Paper text:
Among these is [name], a [name] with ∼35% amino acid identity to the cholesterol-oxidizing [name] CYP142A1 and CYP125A1. However, [name] is highly conserved across pathogenic and non-pathogenic Mycobacterium species, suggesting an important evolutionary role for the protein. In conclusion, we present the first biochemical and structural studies of the [name] [name] [name], revealing novel substrates and inhibitors for the enzyme, defining its relatively polar active site and its ability to adapt structurally to facilitate the binding of bulky ligands. The [name] structures reveal a dynamic molecule, with the BC and FG regions clearly affected by ligand binding.
In contrast, the binding of the smaller imidazole-containing compound 7 does not lead to BC-loop reorientation, and a putative [name] dimer in complex with compound 7 in both of its active sites is observed in the asymmetric unit. The overall conformation is similar to the proposed B-B symmetric dimer, with both chains adopting a conformation resembling the imidazole-bound monomer. In addition to heme iron coordination by the compound 7 imidazole group, further contacts with [name] are limited to hydrogen bonds with Asn-96 and Ser-252 and with the ligand urea moiety, whereas the adamantyl group remains largely solvent-exposed. Although compound 7 occupies a binding pocket similar in nature to that observed for compound 1, it appears that small changes in the conformations of residues lining the compound 7 binding pocket (Gln-86 and Arg-400) lead to distinct packing interactions with the FG-helices of the opposite dimer. HTS type II compounds 7–9 produced new LS EPR spectra consistent with distal ligation of [name] heme iron by a nitrogen atom. The magnitude of change in the g-values for compounds 7–9 suggests heme coordination through the imidazole, aniline, and pyridine nitrogen atoms, respectively.
Author numbering:
A (entry chain B): 7 to 176, 202 to 228, 238 to 412
B (entry chain A): 7 to 176, 201 to 228, 238 to 412
């Protein structure tokens, strides 16, 4: 561990480095990672690689704050200190977090869910209908990105005409206008619900939180799922032959892909974690991408198994900040794989996957496939 | 004023709308501007167009906070509330403001000012030597942008080889964080090192951008606007070019006239009256130095450009505790550029109408096509 820099992004250029986290889990489940030239803020942090200790952190939001602690001016939930701490739902503590989470949730109505589902089924059908069997194409650009971006446009009440403003961005001006329109005439969408309850800055952070959940996190689960099934063709065949297995399979996709593999917190008081003495103000990073392959908890943790049960993965978090979009993500994955696997039992990856170079997101930038 | 929206940027796309602000000074020096669809946050604000009241706000930083007030979560010094309030020098209050201000000015050493000056003189001479007389060219892109960007690169300690990251932004984020890390590893004789080695990466980046803004936006705009004004006033151009002893007075007039940073926001921290109106804690207050700088109660012939204007107690660099730390650097940029240009050229023709930036926070020219002879 002394020689491994978890802030050196070159270690993440080829995917999540499971082999380095095996070392971390074995040698030091909780340890103090000194800063290097790559480390945000020039400051060390506690690094947590195992499941039980990761959950200890997640389940104690008072001790392990999503805002700040000690004399630290601001923290948040990424390793770099950010002044947006406190001002966006994921970087918020109680009592404000409970209120705002209730407000956001109030906008995820049964009708919105059906609106998303109806659009997703039509769109996924159309996209998969236009695939040329056996012809190579980039699955990330042509399919994986499109579906969840349209979902988030529907949640945010972005008119169909204006969705180009969002896509081209993967903006501020358009979002502020969209925000002012909804204050003017409230509309039946989540951006309207939050805008008519907050500053424009807070609204824009919310906007980007969800644009990120779709554009990035959900897209990455989709592409990663296709790659995992491509690597496990026997499992692909089993799954396509009985979609009753799909909900269980989707959970394994999220555990395996862990698209959001790390979180930061800030200790608010002295505390002992994994036998280590944490001080008020210090940064703690948990690695759900490592917890999710902890062999203390998951049998054959380094194998993809679409039947895995139980599957208590931390891919959508755990506790008070648990992913509000978890079921939307599941719905995207379910519909996409129904339409894809109904059509195609052969998935060949024809160039090596190109990964995003990040320790905050595990994502595939390009995945060139042929479907038959 | 009932039919005027000072938050509608269509009103600022052609320069600062001096006509609207003459109406504002006449009708209601201080008044409550209701929000429109263009108004940040959907919230009204007090708008302050006259010199006396502008000055009064600037000079009372306890009442008129640069952070927040009342129950408001965060404010800052633009109309939109920003969560960077409290975390960058200009959006800070005492006691932290004083500490950080002194830190930053400790880096404006005589040797740094010399480094800037020696570079400026060389580059300004190079650039003007390169001009083809009579041939049209974009003064903003070719000259007015270049000089002050080089200045702020010197202040922040950006190696000449990495200066393109900044020019191409006007990728930078990533570069700035590596530059910050390098100043922590190996302290250098520059302003960024001084601040880095006294703060989070965020805070340092916000400081980096503050100075970057100061150079690439505000100083650039003074230079381009100063040339436009001289072009519009050719007799004064001639008088100036005959006697460079007039330059210091002229430069103050350039700053008054151009008012490159023509508005500021504050947040009231307590109940107070301004211009005979009651302000309550939490309420936004926007002052318009661009307007104050043409208030006829203070400036004779206020709507006329006069290079000899004395006195000239303009608010173009602020006033009170947040007064521009770069005032002498901006004046130096202006002085060298106009020495060098007016030495060579007594004829300045603007050949395409000026293209203005669309903003009520900055008054600046995006393109200014000139011929010099
Ligand atoms: C496969 C896709 C997704 C994954 C893996 C994922 C993962 C996560 C995780 C790990 C957290 C916990 C954050 C923390 O502990 O600090 C979270 C929170 C959150 N997610 Fe997702 N997410 C996904 C999709 C979405 C979608 C589509 C939405 C759209 C509604 C969404 C909205 C949210 C929100 C609003 C939070 C913050 C909840 C709170 O702090 O109370 N997520 N997500
Ligand atoms: C013609 C060019 C410039 C103009 C018109 C200008 C204008 C201003 C104004 C109006 C303020 C007051 C802000 C407030 O009251 O909220 C200010 C502050 C400031 N200026 Fe400039 N500026 C110019 C160039 C520069 C330069 C070249 C620097 C480089 C050091 C600079 C550095 C600063 C700093 C650091 C502050 C904040 C000081 C504080 O908050 O304590 N400015 N400037
Ligand atoms: O914090 C997140 N995403 C959390 C992890 C991914 N996710 C999103 C929803 N479910 C999972 N995103 C932002 C995006 C912008 C705006 C704010 C603050 C900074 C900058 C980061 C939020
Ligand atoms: O606040 C200013 N500029 C003040 C007026 C221009 N100026 C600068 C120095 N003298 C004059 N700039 C920032 C630039 C970035 C980073 C912080 C906060 C936001 C976003 C705005 C500062």
């Amino acid at each position: 561990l002394s020689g491994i820099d978890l802030t050196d992004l070159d270690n993440f250029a080829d995917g999540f480095p499971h082999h380095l986290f095996a070392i971390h889990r074995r040698e030091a489940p909780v340890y103090w990672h000194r800063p290097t030239e790559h480390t945000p803020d020039g400051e060390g942090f506690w690094s947590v690689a195992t499941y039980a200790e990761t959950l200890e952190v997640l389940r104690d939001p008072v001790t392990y704050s999503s805002v700040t602690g000690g004399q630290r001016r601001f923290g948040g939930t990424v390793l770099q200190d950010l002044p947006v701490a406190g001002q966006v739902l994921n970087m918020m503590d109680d009592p404000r977090h409970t209120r705002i989470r209730r407000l956001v949730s109030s906008g995820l109505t049964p009708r919105m869910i059906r609106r998303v589902e109806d659009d997703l089924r039509r769109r996924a059908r159309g996209l998969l209908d236009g695939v040329e069997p056996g012809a190579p194409f980039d699955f990330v650009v042509e399919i994986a990105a499109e579906l969840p971006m349209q979902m988030i446009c529907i949640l945010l009440g972005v008119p169909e005409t204006d969705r180009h403003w969002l896509f081209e961005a993967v903006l501020y001006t358009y979002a502020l206008e969209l925000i002012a329109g909804k204050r003017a005439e409230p509309a039946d969408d989540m951006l309207s619900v939050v805008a008519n309850a907050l500053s424009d800055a807070e609204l824009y952070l919310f906007f980007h939180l969800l644009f990120s959940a779709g554009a990035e996190t959900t897209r990455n689960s989709i592409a990663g799922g296709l790659l995992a099934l491509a690597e496990n063709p026997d499992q692909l065949q089993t799954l396509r032959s009985d979609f009753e297995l799909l909900p269980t399979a989707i959970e394994e996709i999220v555990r395996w892909t862990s698209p959001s593999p790390s979180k930061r917190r800030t200790a608010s008081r002295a505390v002992s974690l994994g036998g280590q003495p944490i001080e008020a103000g210090q940064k703690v990073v948990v690695w759900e991408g490592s917890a999710n392959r902890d062999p203390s908890v998951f049998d054959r943790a380094d194998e993809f198994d679409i039947t895995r049960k139980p599957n208590p993965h931390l891919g959508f978090g755990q506790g008070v900040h648990y992913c509000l979009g978890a079921n939307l993500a599941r719905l995207e994955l379910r519909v996409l794989f129904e339409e894809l696997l109904s059509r195609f039992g052969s998935v060949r990856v024809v160039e090596p996957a190109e990964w995003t170079r990040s320790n905050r997101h595990t994502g595939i930038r390009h995945l060139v496939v042929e479907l038959r």
